[PDB]
Design an enzyme around this catalytic site. Structure first.
Site, PDB file in Angstrom:
ATOM      1  N   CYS A  84       0.748  -1.257   0.000  1.00  0.00           N
ATOM      2  CA  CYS A  84       0.000   0.000   0.000  1.00  0.00           C
ATOM      3  C   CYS A  84       0.782   1.315   0.000  1.00  0.00           C
ATOM      4  O   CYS A  84       0.323   2.308  -0.572  1.00  0.00           O
ATOM      5  CB  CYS A  84      -0.972   0.008   1.188  1.00  0.00           C
ATOM      6  SG  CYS A  84      -1.513  -1.644   1.750  1.00  0.00           S
ATOM      7  N   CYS A 102       1.400   3.724  -3.214  1.00  0.00           N
ATOM      8  CA  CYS A 102       0.392   4.679  -3.652  1.00  0.00           C
ATOM      9  C   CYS A 102      -0.082   5.622  -2.552  1.00  0.00           C
ATOM     10  O   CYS A 102      -0.422   6.775  -2.825  1.00  0.00           O
ATOM     11  CB  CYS A 102      -0.821   3.947  -4.237  1.00  0.00           C
ATOM     12  SG  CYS A 102      -0.478   2.971  -5.738  1.00  0.00           S
ATOM     13  N   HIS A 146       9.561  11.245 -12.908  1.00  0.00           N
ATOM     14  CA  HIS A 146      10.108   9.927 -12.676  1.00  0.00           C
ATOM     15  C   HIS A 146      11.456   9.780 -13.357  1.00  0.00           C
ATOM     16  O   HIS A 146      12.476  10.167 -12.796  1.00  0.00           O
ATOM     17  CB  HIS A 146       9.126   8.821 -13.106  1.00  0.00           C
ATOM     18  CG  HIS A 146       9.516   7.456 -12.625  1.00  0.00           C
ATOM     19  ND1 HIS A 146       9.628   7.145 -11.284  1.00  0.00           N
ATOM     20  CD2 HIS A 146       9.884   6.339 -13.293  1.00  0.00           C
ATOM     21  CE1 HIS A 146      10.045   5.903 -11.152  1.00  0.00           C
ATOM     22  NE2 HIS A 146      10.214   5.387 -12.359  1.00  0.00           N
TER      23      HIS A 146
END
Ligand code: DHE
Ligand code: DHE
Ligand code: HEM
Ligand code: HEM
Lengths: 542, 532
Positions: free
Chosen positions: A40, A43, A320
């Protein structure tokens, strides 16, 4: 989104339960904690402050209540939340555990500063005791450093004979390999924040120094400004949010900088801005650092670490990866969640342009530079979200009308692409489709003939290379990933990434004929992913 | 309201109601000394790992009774009732509550432009001598008084933020900026028939500093404000106060390179050599040179200096920044032209507190900058002329006593031959109500302590009620007269005393019912030009 499994392996004491909340035992909490960081936190953030997913802090979750959480974790949502329960990914017991965990106080992961780094710093071979010249007879510039992901090792393979020269243990899955500007030192960064420095001049290359720089990290780069060869290395971390400048010969930590700050657009404080790609300037003695969540690109001047000069450029959120253009002057990077390419002039240290690619989730790697027959110099990127390949003009002086505009967009094999590749000596453009659900696609590569491109609006045709088929692997769903050329640009390698207990391989394609050349298979070749040719990496040739 | 944390084994839990109650008392009363994140600052660190070892009763006592070192008697004073004390004692055993942030959205909600730039005067509409005006802080009244430097008449009293800490002037001398300790910023147009607040904004919860752009060619372009909480500085449009850029100061300490979640912004000055602001970040020991020529591609130079940076000033030539890392008794010197650290020297005294300091030409040493100390009675001089006096440059050349410990400000002016030193925080009324004056021309620097004259400022004001404290000398435009505040309580009698610089005699005593708790005074001309 990232899996922060090294953080997951951290054992924490269960917190007490406040008003209206049920408490978990130390065992239940820790089980739930490991799941959170592994599945988890990518995100939702390590601090539960939110990133791709919403914030899951106690103030918000306690208002929603256990039942709301339980259902959401179970069924998911179309907006992007996975169906952990119904998919069977998480057991009914684990779903309840997570719902409970989210109502409790977030586990505060530890910081990792100078003291901590110095304690982990180990110099195995002092600079004085190292070779004064290359002591092995290897062709270092044609060597390939390959990530053996799940095995926590890297393999050094000969670029001309395909002989696996050596397999080195790093201790944990590494993400990438980078080379010093002289080509003597190989730096590998582990997902766990561990940095290993390997001296390629020794009779038998081995780690001469190691250091830990955080809990989760994915990037590292070396100084490449002329005159600064072998002087510094820089590593960036996901947790804690910081980058570290280290001595290029001993790995001694010199400067640690936090990336916590304000988002460029809303100028709201963000407690967890992850460091993404890091590149090195060829025009100024600076490192180029992408800070994801805040949407800022930092130009860090390393000529004076005490009176540190930096240029913080407001770009776009969710930066990114990216790469330099053919001339090495402009940095082109993907703000993936927003489908934008950001262009930075490294000579002047300013933002030049921000363009929408027209595709979903651009993921260029370092990208591919080539001279398009009609458009002139361009840089290309493929996308994870769709099958499009986009070209951006990179020649402000020679083709001013095409500069920083998306000149063309055309389909390749399919969605799920991760890397596009070419070389100055090649007339071909290779595009993978690693994450595509269809096995026939994820096991293949699309090849475009650059010389046949016209940019007349028509979509250029491509040849499909059945890489996985050529490798003789059908077991499991082999995924082909990342093309990487040899020093001469006459051969291109692909990884045939299979499971840890399955058979993997590396496929060498003859660039001139587009025919299979050689297949590398070996028991030690466990989950091969990233491959980096020494020469192409040290010189930024792509 | 915050989410109450769970309680560990042994530690009692507090209801969401209880916790939020205790949290507000803490953030309003204790946060200032112990730090919003309980990391400690002007008080000991009250983090869980330390508090839990001490135990309930230990905390409960310290809260009710206090101590001599600085901790107030909350229980015995009646400030906190029995229940509140126990609440706070238990609160301290629980994890620290995450304080509220204050970003762009919040600043913009508080931003108000009363008179748009296009609706303002194109020339001075009043007939005041603006350059000789004094902006005086009426601390506890949440107002500032604009007073005529030659007639001594209160021209106007304006309502601002509570307890304004300082007044700063734009480089043109037109706009007056004030910042309340609550983070409230008021911009006043001195060209209007009746000057008034033309724009206001709030930049945080607790703040102390503000400065304007002073690089030639950037007059009236920007203003910058720094906050204690949240740890950040904000660059604002110099005409509308529109927030343009916010930068967090959270980061690594310069020496141990460990993360610090609360590095407060202290003094902020403006460079005269480059279009930059000079920002002191206290807890991390870093000085930032922020280039304001491009806010989107922001260039900054982060200088590792010494921890606990507080106040400081520029030397006479305006090239070197000399600042006090107070808790460590050091003076840090920065070259604003080259953008780098030049030196760090110990003053030999305890807790240097220069304000902006005092620049003068010492008869034997040449150009020097001086500072007094809060911890002792010493005044220390540092050479500031690398070119003409290389051997004396950045070295403590002399240290001598003044009235006593508790000094806050030292002052002089180019046209004066005197150096004025207060002793505001001295416990002895006779001392706190006086000022020491050294004759610069009589200084020889032979090792003997220069003698000084004592001016009975409070006595001159005719104030004996309470223990009035004299603070901060400030000169008029010509440097012919120096003003001092005779700071007394909100319901006590205060005054401003004007001294004739050439004769050292009383010139005028300003008293008015409206002059409540006068503290900081800033002459327009001397502030806009950095003349000290
Ligand atoms: C920040 C970052 C970079 C840029 C490094 C630099 O500039 O030095 C990078 C580069 C890379 C590069 C660089 C390629 C190049 O040519 O420069 C490769 C091969 C690569 C293989 C993979 N990456 Fe990567 N990667 C992440 C992060 C990053 N990847 C993630 O966060 C993500 C999405 C999820 C995670 O949990 O890590 C992720 C998953 C993967 C994979 O699954 C890949 C395909 C296989 C593997 O080994 O994990 N990443
Ligand atoms: C950061 C800072 C500056 C520099 C401002 C700049 O560069 O723009 C400053 C300057 C100042 C200056 C600047 C004088 C100058 O000539 O530049 C003055 C008059 C001043 C009046 C006071 N200050 Fe000040 N002051 C603090 C902070 C600061 N004070 C504190 O943290 C402290 C110790 C505790 C507090 O609660 O604020 C503190 C107490 C005081 C007082 O008690 C004073 C005497 C009375 C008052 O009005 O509150 N401070
Ligand atoms: C890991 C097993 C995991 C948990 C736990 C989790 C929980 C969670 C909740 C409780 C919500 C609801 C929040 C709300 O305010 O409504 C929620 C929402 C979203 N999530 Fe999630 N989530 C877990 C994992 C993941 C992963 C791996 C991703 C990213 C691929 C992700 C994303 C999201 C998104 C998006 C949402 C936003 C709201 C929506 O309508 O989808 N989550 N998650
Ligand atoms: C706010 C209502 C408040 C509380 C609560 C509080 C508590 C407190 C404790 C329990 C200690 C003991 C710390 C230790 O480690 O022994 C302590 C100590 C000091 N404090 Fe405090 N404190 C509150 C408020 C304030 C305020 C407003 C100030 C600043 C005037 C302040 C300062 C200090 C100082 C100094 C200490 C250090 C130890 C000493 O002997 O004084 N506190 N406080």
């Amino acid at each position: 989104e990232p899996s922060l499994d090294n953080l997951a392996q951290q054992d924490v004491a269960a917190p007490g339960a406040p008003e209206g909340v049920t408490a978990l035992s130390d065992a239940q909490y820790n089980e739930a904690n490991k799941i959170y960081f592994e599945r988890c936190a990518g995100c939702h953030g390590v601090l539960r402050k939110g990133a791709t997913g919403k914030a899951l802090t106690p103030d918000l979750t306690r208002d929603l209540g256990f039942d709301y959480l339980q259902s959401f974790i179970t069924y998911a949502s179309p907006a992007g939340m996975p169906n952990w329960g119904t998919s069977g990914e998480l057991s009914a017991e684990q779903v309840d555990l997570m719902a409970n965990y989210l109502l409790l106080d977030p586990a505060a992961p530890p910081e990792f500063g100078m003291k901590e780094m110095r304690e982990s710093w180990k110099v195995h071979v002092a600079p004085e005791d190292r070779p004064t010249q290359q002591m092995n007879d290897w062709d270092l510039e044609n060597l390939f450093s390959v990530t053996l992901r799940d095995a926590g090792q890297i393999a050094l393979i000969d670029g001309s004979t395909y002989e696996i020269k050596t397999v080195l243990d790093t201790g944990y899955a590494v993400h990438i390999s980078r080379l010093s500007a002289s080509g003597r030192y190989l730096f590998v960064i582990g997902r766990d924040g561990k940095v290993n420095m390997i001296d390629l001049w020794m009779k038998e290359p081995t780690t001469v120094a190691e250091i830990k720089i955080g809990s989760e990290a994915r990037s590292i780069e070396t100084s490449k400004m002329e005159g600064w060869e072998d002087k510094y290395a820089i590593a960036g971390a996901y947790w804690p949010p910081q980058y570290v400048i280290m001595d290029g010969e001993t790995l001694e930590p010199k400067k640690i900088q936090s990336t916590r700050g304000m988002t460029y657009d809303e100028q709201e404080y963000h407690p967890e801005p992850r460091v993404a790609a890091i590149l090195a300037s060829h025009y100024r003695p600076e490192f180029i650092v992408n800070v994801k969540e805040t949407g800022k690109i930092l130009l860090v001047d390393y000529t004076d670490l005490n009176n540190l000069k930096t240029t913080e450029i407001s770009a776009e959120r969710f930066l990114h990866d990216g790469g330099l253009d053919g001339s090495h002057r402009y940095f082109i990077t993907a703000a993936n969640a927003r489908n934008k390419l950001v262009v930075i002039d490294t000579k002047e240290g300013k933002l030049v342009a921000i363009e929408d690619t027209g595709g979903q989730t651009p993921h260029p790697g370092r990208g591919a530079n080539f001279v398009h027959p009609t458009f002139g110099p361009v840089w290309a990127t493929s996308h994870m979200g769709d099958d499009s390949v986009a070209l951006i003009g990179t020649d402000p002086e020679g083709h001013p009308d095409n500069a920083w505009k998306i000149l063309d967009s055309f389909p390749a094999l399919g969605g799920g692409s991760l890397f596009i590749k070419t070389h100055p000596n090649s007339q071909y453009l290779y595009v993978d489709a690693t994450l595509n659900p269809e096995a026939e696609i994820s096991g293949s590569v699309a090849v475009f003939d650059i010389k046949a491109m016209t940019g007349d609006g028509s979509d250029p045709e491509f040849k499909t290379l059945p890489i996985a088929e050529w490798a003789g692997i059908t077991e499991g769903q082999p995924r082909v990933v990342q093309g990487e050329f040899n020093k001469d640009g006459t051969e291109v390698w692909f990884s045939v990434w299979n499971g840890k207990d399955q058979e993997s391989a590396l496929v060498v394609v003859d660039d001139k004929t587009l025919e299979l050349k050689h297949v590398i298979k070996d028991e030690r070749l466990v989950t091969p992913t990233g491959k980096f040719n020494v020469y192409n990496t040290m010189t930024d040739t792509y």
